[PDB]
Amino acid sequence: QYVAGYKVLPPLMDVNMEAAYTSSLLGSIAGVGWTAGLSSFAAIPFAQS
Amino acid sequence: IFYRLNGVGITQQVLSENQKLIANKFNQALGAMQTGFTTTNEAFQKVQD
Predict the structure, then answer these.
(1) Are A32 and A45 in contact (CB under 8 A)?
(2) Residues whose CB falls within 8 Å of the CB of residue A45, separated by 6 or more in sequence, listed in order
(3) B8–chain A Cβ distance below 8 A for any pair
(4) Which residues contact B23 (CB under 8 A, 6 or more apart)?
(5) What distance, in Å, lies between the first and last C-alpha atoms of chain A?
(6) Cβ pair A32, A25 in contact under 8 A
């Protein structure tokens, strides 16, 4: 990919950050899905969700 | 607007007592984008594109 005369751009996020994003999503799925409306947060433990 | 705000999960008490401030907020929100028609707006950029 170097000798043939092109390049591959790095992604917009580091791996490390993509991850956070998924950690935040995993923390929020247990809470958002309890009542309609994104304004509040209700992060109940997963079993009761 | 009052019925929709009741429907999106806001109680009728605060709507019944605070019409003036939410009216001012709505008017300011509508008036803000009137002068915002420039390069900073993404939809304006998409229209130009």
Answers:
(1) no
(2) A30
(3) yes
(4) none
(5) 48
(6) no
Provide the number of CB pairs (under 8 Å) joining chain A to chain B. 5
The structure tokens 């309609």 sit at A36
Question: A38 — contact with chain B (CB < 8 Å)?
Answer: no
Å between A12 CA and nearest CA of chain B: 19
Query: How long is chain B?
Result: 49
| B11 vs A: CB within 8 A | no
First to last CA, chain B: 34
Q: Solved how?
A: cryo-EM
All residues at 6 or more sequence positions from A8 whose CB lies less than 8 Å from its CB, including other chains: A1
Resolution (angstroms) equals 4.1
